[PDB]
């Protein structure tokens, strides 16, 4: 017998400087099967939350239906107040760390905004380590999109042209239609190359005034 | 009354009362003390010798040991005595294992105590009829310790204590003959200052008395009976008068 | 490896004329290793005796608890224990672990001090009751051993003939065996009186 | 790997250790003191799996300071040794054991007489003059039945030892950094200091 | 019918006709024995008071401890029966030490006053279907002092009954009745810190058997900023002085 | 587990007025194929279906329940047959936490499940999920090889989101029905029987 | 996966890799590896990263509440052996915790401890841990000295770890300094490889038979 | 007043514990028994009530017991709650030895077996123990020893006690003439002149009694429970001249 297996996706999410953003595919596999061609992954978790489950899927959405019930209890009991990130970064730790013996083939990101107003995004594993990055990306097409970014948002492994080996370029935070111009050339610059993406684009733009989301498609 | 039997309910002022029975039950026992000055801390209990088929190579002490570094007197009847001591030890034996660092005295008392207030808490379940004094140094430290137990589960600190018998006579009697600010300064004085904390109420009597004494490098003795009778004697002489 | 074949000890029970026979090696260590030329295999409880085999662990334990037991027997009863009992305590003493169990050659031994008659018997590690009346043994050596006093022992022996018929079975075999023999011991019964004698063989 | 000896004398007893801590590849530690010391006149020594090594002895001796802090009269050896196994004879067959083997030296004061038991991660007990664990005793069940009889002085162990070491760093292919030792008498336990 | 209390008095689970029950009625009786205790609350700072009751000479009056903290930025005080305080507290800090945990933040105060709350009423059914842990409702009336960031400097009076409410200026425990009318006409929402330090040890004064010295008193404060502290001998003693030198002017 | 009397695949497809699904009627041994008088349809009320998969043995276990659990919602709600009754998302998710709550256990059960039905409003409903729990929807569905036969052909009529409203009855029926030729002539373990179901946000229900 | 620490006679010092690798490539070069669990104590997760970080956190709960009540600190010789008690009843589980804690008192001086899932726990002058920690040890193994200066100190442990990524796939992106004592413990900077790596070449002057 | 007897916890105003009082005279029914302690061996007694013809008064002894072969017990009071305590103490002694292998001293089983009497002085609704005892035993830490154990759970070590009924003579006839050294042949012919005179009847039989004897008067040094049969205490009885 095998308790769990695989269902693909592959998605990443980034922290701007007063913003941030989450991307999902949107392609269920089972063994080179589409399984279906839309199915979301990503939700608007209350108090401008936004997180995803890539990998098994049915783990993917019970951790998920805890949290929607963690966070209103924290309301109840708390009255109504607003639930910061930081709780989130390892209130996760708990509900995976309750399972380290029979555990959720999950990982799980986070966006959303601290009280700075900026950005971060979480990364997890599927046993519960709590850490911090603003550039992210997970699935199985995952060790296949990081390098793009490291050399455009972090300008990573290129210096500036004039001194060839002095000095280093300068950085930005990156606006919003950089990234959605960026991730949504990181798909297209995979599907081809690869098999289990394709077949939809959720983005989860966050901002003071709210959540929006945006959808794009691709070559089935 | 009606309100004077049990241990879940109140009267219709706020005193619950058996706790209060119990420490008329302390009373009917014989005294204890316990004195402190700086580079040392002391205890004494009266004794008795009534009885002479008695064996008295194994006279009854209420003196008890927990650890090297500790002691333990108690007041009230003994039945109880030897239980606390046999949970009290056990603790401070299973703490090191735990964390070896000994026992913090205030780590002790709140073990000693929390084991008479679960057995206030319940019907069903009796207090205990007794009041301790503690006595002993940390690990790595000079500062010379002591508190009390007591049923109602609480405890406090205490710079010179009697109880048991006839306590409302040597309390006041160290209220004048102390003072918190020029302690003793040395293992005689202490001694002697407990001494004739006891011999207004002890029919003149030496072969009465047990004296144990407690310093660093987790020590502890007893003193010997020759040892208390020139400790006596020489007082009668300051009372020539 | 088995537990049965780890430390090593041989054992000898032979009826006789009002005279029984008891003996056992000393020889005890690890796998390919001894530690001690003396370790007393055998015991007594009252005047009936016993002799265990096997893992070391269960022959110290099991003199414990067996301790722990007549010495109530006797308190309780007012009388000492005779064998006929014991050895049915023995099995339901055993197979009450049946999984999980100990892992022992026992054997028993002693008169019933009614009818003067002597008695032995032996064991398995869950409780089968065997009643051979000539002889039983117990040990790592047991084929070695089987040949070697079944062609010796007649019936109706007598004490000191019945002794030198023990040792010389005790010694030709754990001489043999590989895993025994740093010198040896036997005790002669009667109905009322006891004696021991050791034994000379070699040694490392 | 992990050695561990000692040896009785006509009026005095001796133990040995190592000083090793080897954790995969690297060696960490050169100073691991692998006794407790569970009453003033007896001691133990003990050898086998990390952590279980440890809070054995720890277990232990906080019930055998808890005998001896109310009858205010410490119980000889034999009451230990035949203690100690109790816990491992139920220890091995339950769920987690505690693979350690282990030494026990002391002096009982009413005969005048020392003794010295040798116990294994099973039960085994029994009584020797000399004794050790591991792969070790395989080099030294052999001197000391010839170059040992049971009418020396305290001296003659170190002297006895400071070779019987040499016979093992001169084979064993696994360094040990070298031992401490130390001493049972009536005036109690004595660490050497030097080798 | 007269014998309404007489005979529905004991047991805990009786309703008398009334509609009343008489067994908490009593243990809010306790805590007016014991020792007063104060607390005032400002835009500033919050602030407790206490006396201590003087018993013996030779006691060591560091040793019975009416105000504890309990978290950084909490404090508490009681004027009860007393072993039946660290029962409480021993729990109360617990939650916001478990709160740093599974929520990783500075608890808010009154969610600690509702855990609290939810602990004296375990003489019958908690929130979530517990069933009992004990039948002697206990005496300990508390005063939380506490900061946390959605409503700034809070107290609050948590009794066995389990209801509570955020005074601003309370005062528990013997000389209540006397103090509790004197700051109802002494409080302003527009104090300061040491505008009410030096009221607190005029109140206490005049209510109090004995007179007032730093030896009979002290107090705590609490600051976003620094923190619980319960402030010392020798600073309490320079406040007395100094209000002396106002009085008389 | 290890299953022995396992069924085979059923097939499904949403449409404007409603939806479809439909499977076939065997109860397997092995290669053999004992039993052919079973259903694999367990109407619920009058507006949901669940075709069912896998082990027949625990097929049974389903409907004994379900029958249950409608009867359960009758008790102490006499507006229980207009608006309060069951829709299918009212069930789904007993039939899946179910069996989240039924792998961490260990014991599992090998069918797998699929729903259709309509909601009070009147819009298309369909999901699916399989014995370890996973759950997904769209227009179109099937089971073991009929998603890797089937599922292919269907979405040929039916390709997205936007289509579902350029399609009727007459159209969906004749598609499926020549989606059984193909399992019928090729599978290994099907069978020329069948056993409809439609379903109509106007007109309601009807069975083979 | 390297870390270290060590003592002297003005402090205690951790140094750390920044790893964060699984098969043959890394999920992550920016992962925090020494866990602020109080101002006076810290400890590294080296080995299982969410085995540790649970319960050196959960650690600082009960060393918190160990002080409120006795109102004293906490020693050190509690904190390693109370996380090893609690270990011990979980082996033969899947727990794969290997490291140390550090702290500074007023009582013990200083003081390190190791600490691991198979249950042990022993005090030090020197730790280093990881999967290059034979690497670390010949840099400080063959120089330093407990009448040491600082910084020296937080220079050697740069380059005590830094043979790590020079001869390691698995041990490497940045590096991370604390030194501590009785007021607390003291950050000294995220420091990047490839940026420090071109600095101690021409300084050091090692690397003799390489580029550069 | 409001009468405070009705459970063995209730605390009385004055502080104390009624019912565990009147067990203190539920022990006065009982049937005396005596102990002195020799320089050379102690010696116990006893003393029945019901001795009528026919029933075997002969091998069955009531009170005497013994725990292992150092130690013996004479009992005074409820019999019900004998067999009860004696087993277990029994069973105590030997789950000492079988895992420290060596015997059981007696101020270890006398410390523990009463404060399992104080077990049932405390907690529940249950009853304390209608009990005494006389121990008698040897140790090397002290030798020879006595000791003895209230239906309270508290203990104290002796020289010569008599429990039961009229001890208050019985102590009385016997501290005025108790020597210190007093051989144990010599403290026979005490024991029973105490239960010659403090009993009600005149007869002083062979049947209502039974006294045994410690001894380690052997050589090769060891311990002997010697117990008494009815044929020899007549030899003891004739010798003194009733």
């Given amino acids: ?220 | 009354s009606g309100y004077d039997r049990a241990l879940s309910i109140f009267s219709p002022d706020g005193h619950i009362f058996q706790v209060e029975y119990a420490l008329e039950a302390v009373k009917r026992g014989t005294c204890a003390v316990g004195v402190k000055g700086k580079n040392c801390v002391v205890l004494g209990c009266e004794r008795r010798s009534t009885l002479k088929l008695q064996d008295t190579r194994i006279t009854p002490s209420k003196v008890s040991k927990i650890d090297s570094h500790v002691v333990l007197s108690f007041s009230g009847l003994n039945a109880d005595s030897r239980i606390l001591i046999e949970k009290a030890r056990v603790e401070a034996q299973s703490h090191r294992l735990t964390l070896e660092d000994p026992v913090t005295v205030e780590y002790l008392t709140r073990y000693v105590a929390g084991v008479q207030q679960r057995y206030t808490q319940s019907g069903g379940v009796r207090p205990f009829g007794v009041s301790t004094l503690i006595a002993g140094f940390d690990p790595r430290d000079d500062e010379p310790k002591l508190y009390q137990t007591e049923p109602s589960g609480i405890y406090s600190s205490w710079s010179a204590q009697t109880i048991g018998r006839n306590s409302k006579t040597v309390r006041e009697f160290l209220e004048k003959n102390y003072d918190r600010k020029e302690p003793p300064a040395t293992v005689e004085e202490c001694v002697k200052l407990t001494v004739r904390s006891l011999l207004e109420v002890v029919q003149t009597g030496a072969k009465n008395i047990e004296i144990t004494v407690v310093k660093p490098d987790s020590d502890i003795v007893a003193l010997s009976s020759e040892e208390i009778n020139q400790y006596v004697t020489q007082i009668e002489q300051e009372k020539q008068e | 490896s088995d537990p049965s074949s780890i430390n090593g000890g041989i054992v000898v029970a032979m009826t006789g004329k009002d005279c029984v026979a008891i003996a056992c090696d000393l020889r005890l260590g690890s796998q390919s290793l001894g530690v001690s030329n003396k370790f007393e295999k055998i015991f007594h409880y009252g005047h009936v005796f016993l002799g265990i085999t096997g893992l070391a662990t269960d022959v110290t334990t099991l003199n414990e608890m067996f301790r722990y037991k007549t010495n109530l027997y006797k308190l309780k009863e007012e009388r000492a224990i005779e064998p006929e009992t014991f050895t049915q305590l023995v099995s339901s003493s055993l197979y009450e672990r049946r999984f999980g169990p100990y892992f022992v050659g026992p054997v028993v031994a002693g008169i019933n001090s009614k009818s003067g008659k002597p008695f032995i018997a032996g064991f398995d590690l869950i409780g089968c009751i065997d009643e051979a009346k000539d002889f039983i043994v117990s040990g790592t050596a047991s084929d070695q051993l089987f040949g070697m006093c079944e062609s010796l022992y007649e019936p109706n022996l007598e004490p000191e003939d019945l002794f030198e018929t023990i040792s010389q079975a005790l010694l030709n075999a754990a001489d043999r065996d590989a895993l025994s023999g740093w010198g040896a011991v036997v005790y002669i019964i009667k109905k009322d009186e006891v004696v021991k004698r050791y034994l000379k063989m070699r040694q490392d | ?195 | 019918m007269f014998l309404t209390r007489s005979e529905y008095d004991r047991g805990v689970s009786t309703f008398s006709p009334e509609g009343r029950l008489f067994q908490v009625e009593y243990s809010l009786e306790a805590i007016k024995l014991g020792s007063t205790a104060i607390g005032i609350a400002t835009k500033e700072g919050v602030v407790l008071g206490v006396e201590k009751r003087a018993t013996s000479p030779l006691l060591e009056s560091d040793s019975i401890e009416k105000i504890v903290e309990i978290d950084r930025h909490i404090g508490c005080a009681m004027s009860g029966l007393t072993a039946d305080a660290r029962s409480m507290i021993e729990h109360a800090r617990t939650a916001a030490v478990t709160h740093n945990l599974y929520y990783d933040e500075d608890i808010n105060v009154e969610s600690l006053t509702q855990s609290v709350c939810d602990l004296a009423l375990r003489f019958g059914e908690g929130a979530s279907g517990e069933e009992r842990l004990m039948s002697r409702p206990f005496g300990v009336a508390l005063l939380i002092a506490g900061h946390d960031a959605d409503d700034g400097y809070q107290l609050f009076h948590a009794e066995p009954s389990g209801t509570f409410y955020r005074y601003n200026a309370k005062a528990i425990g013997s000389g209540s009745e006397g103090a509790q009318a004197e700051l109802l006409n002494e409080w302003h929402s527009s104090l300061t810190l040491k505008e009410a330090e030096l009221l607190v040890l005029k109140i206490l004064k005049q209510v109090m058997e004995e007179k007032l010295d730093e030896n009979n008193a002290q107090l705590s404060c609490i600051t976003k900023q620094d923190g619980f502290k319960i402030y010392d001998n020798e600073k309490t003693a320079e406040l007395i002085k100094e209000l002396k030198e106002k009085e008389a002017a | ?208 | 996966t390297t870390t270290l620490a060590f003592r002297f006679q003005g402090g205690i010092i951790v140094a750390v890799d920044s790893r964060a690798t699984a098969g043959n490539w890394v999920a992550s070069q920016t992962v925090k590896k020494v866990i602020e669990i109080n101002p006076f104590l810290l400890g590294t997760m080296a080995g299982g990263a969410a085995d540790c970080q649970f319960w050196e956190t959960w650690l600082g709960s009960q060393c918190r509440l160990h002080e409120l009540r006795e109102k004293e600190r906490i020693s050190v010789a509690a904190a390693s052996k109370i996380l090893s008690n609690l270990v011990y009843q979980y082996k033969g589980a899947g727990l794969s915790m290997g490291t140390m804690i550090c702290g500074y008192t007023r009582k013990e001086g200083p003081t390190i401890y190791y600490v691991d899932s198979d249950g042990t726990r022993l005090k030090g002058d020197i730790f280093c841990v990881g999967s290059g920690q034979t690497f670390a040890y010949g840099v400080l193994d063959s120089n330093y000295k407990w009448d040491l200066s600082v910084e020296d100190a937080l220079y050697l442990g740069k380059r005590s770890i830094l043979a790590a990524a020079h001869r390691d796939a698995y041990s490497g992106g940045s590096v991370n300094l604390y030194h501590v004592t009785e007021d607390g413990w003291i950050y000294h900077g995220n420091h990047d490889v490839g940026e420090l790596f071109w600095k101690v070449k021409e300084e050091e002057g090692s690397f003799n038979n390489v580029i550069g | 007043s409001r009468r405070y007897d009705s459970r063995t916890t209730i605390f009385s105003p004055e502080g104390r514990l009624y019912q565990v009082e009147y067990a203190l005279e539920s022990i006065s029914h009982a049937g005396t028994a005596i102990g002195i302690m020799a320089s050379d061996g102690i010696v116990l007694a006893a003393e029945r009530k019901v001795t009528s013809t026919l029933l075997e008064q002969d091998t069955s002894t009531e009170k005497l017991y013994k725990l292992n072969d150092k130690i013996a017990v004479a009992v005074a009071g409820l019999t019900a709650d004998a067999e009860i305590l004696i087993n277990t103490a029994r069973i105590h002694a030997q789950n000492y030895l079988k895992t420290y292998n060596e015997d059981i001293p007696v101020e270890i089983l006398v410390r523990r077996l009463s404060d399992i009497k104080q077990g049932y002085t405390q907690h529940g609704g249950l009853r304390p123990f209608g009990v005494s005892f006389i121990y008698a035993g040897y140790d090397d830490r002290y030798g020879y020893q006595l000791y003895t154990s209230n239906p309270s759970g508290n203990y104290t070590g002796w020289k010569a006690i008599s429990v039961g009924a009229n001890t208050s003579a019985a102590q009385t006839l016997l501290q005025m003439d108790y020597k210190d050294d007093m051989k144990v042949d010599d403290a026979i012919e005490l024991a029973l002149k105490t239960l010659s005179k403090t009993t009600d009847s005149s007869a002083l039989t062979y049947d209502r009694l039974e006294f045994a004897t410690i001894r380690k008067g052997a050589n090769d040094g060891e311990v002997y429970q010697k117990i008494f049969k009815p044929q020899e205490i007549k030899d003891i009885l004739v010798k003194t001249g009733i």
């Fill in chain 6, 1 to 208: 587990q290890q299953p022995i009397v396992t069924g085979t695949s059923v097939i499904s497809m949403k449409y404007d007025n409603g939806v479809i699904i439909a499977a076939d009627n065997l109860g397997s041994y092995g290669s053999l194929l004992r039993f052919n008088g079973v259903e694999r349809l367990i109407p619920v009320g009058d507006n949901t279906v669940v075709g069912i998969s896998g082990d027949i043995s625990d097929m049974q276990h389903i409907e004994r329940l379900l029958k249950d659990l409608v009867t359960e919602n009758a008790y102490d709600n006499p507006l229980a047959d207009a608006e309060e009754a069951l829709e299918p998302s009212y069930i789904f998710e007993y039939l899946a936490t179910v069996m989240y709550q039924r792998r961490s256990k260990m014991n599992p059960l090998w069918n797998a499940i699929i729903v259709a039905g309509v909601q009070s409003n009147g819009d298309q409903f369909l999901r699916y999920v399989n014995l370890l729990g996973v759950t997904y929807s769209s227009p179109t569905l099937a089971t073991g090889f009929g998603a890797h036969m089937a599922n292919p052909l269907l979405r040929k009529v039916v390709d997205r989101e936007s289509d579902i409203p350029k399609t009727t009855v007459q159209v969906a029926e004749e598609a499926i029905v020549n989606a059984m030729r193909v399992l019928y002539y090729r599978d290994a373990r099907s069978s020329r029987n069948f056993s409809l179901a439609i379903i109509d946000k106007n007109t309601g229900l009807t069975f083979k």
């Fill in chain 4, 1 to 195: 790997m992990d050695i561990i000896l000692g040896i009785r004398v006509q009026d005095s007893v001796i133990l040995a250790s190592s000083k090793a801590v080897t954790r995969g590849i690297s060696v960490l530690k050169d100073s691991d003191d692998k006794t407790r010391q569970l009453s003033p006149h007896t001691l133990m020594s003990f050898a086998g799996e990390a952590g279980d090594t440890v809070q054995f002895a720890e277990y232990i001796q906080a019930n055998i300071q808890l005998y001896s802090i109310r009858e205010d009269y410490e119980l000889s050896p034999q009451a230990v040794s035949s203690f100690v196994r109790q816990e491992l004879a139920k220890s091995i067959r339950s769920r987690r054991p505690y693979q350690v083997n282990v030494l026990i030296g002391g002096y009982d004061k009413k005969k005048n007489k020392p003794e010295l038991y040798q116990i294994d991660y099973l039960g085994t007990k029994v009584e020797l003059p000399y004794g050790a664990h591991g792969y070790s005793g395989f080099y030294t069940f052999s001197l000391l039945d010839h170059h040992y009889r049971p009418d020396m002085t305290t001296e003659e162990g170190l002297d006895l030892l400071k070779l019987c070491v040499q016979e093992l760093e001169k084979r064993m292919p696994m360094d040990f950094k070298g031992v401490i030792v130390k001493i049972v008498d009536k005036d109690g336990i004595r660490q050497v200091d030097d080798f």
């Fill in chain 1, 1 to 220: 017998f095998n308790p769990y297996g695989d269902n693909g996706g592959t998605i990443l999410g980034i922290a701007g400087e007063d913003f941030a953003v989450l991307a999902g595919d949107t392609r269920n596999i089972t063994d080179y099967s589409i399984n279906s061609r839309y199915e979301p992954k990503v939700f608007d978790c209350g108090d401008n939350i936004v997180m995803s489950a890539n990998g098994f899927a049915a783990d993917g959405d019970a951790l998920v239906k805890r949290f929607k019930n963690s966070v209103k209890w924290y309301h109840f009991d708390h009255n109504d107040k607003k639930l910061s990130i930081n709780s989130a970064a390892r209130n996760i730790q708990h509900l995976l760390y309750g399972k380290r013996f029979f555990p959720y083939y999950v990982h799980t990101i986070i966006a959303g905004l601290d009280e700075d107003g900026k950005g971060a995004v979480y990364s997890f594993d599927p046993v519960g380590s709590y850490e911090r990055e603003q550039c992210r990306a997970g699935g199985a097409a995952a060790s296949l999109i990081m390098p793009f970014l490291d050399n455009q948002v972090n300008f990573k492994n290129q210096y500036e042209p004039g001194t060839n080996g002095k000095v280093k370029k300068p950085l930005k935070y990156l606006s919003v239609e950089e990234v959605i111009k960026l991730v949504r050339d990181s798909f297209t610059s995979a599907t081809e190359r690869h098999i289990q993406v394709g077949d939809g684009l959720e983005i989860l733009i966050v901002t003071k005034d709210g959540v929006r989301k945006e959808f794009y498609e691709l070559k089935r």
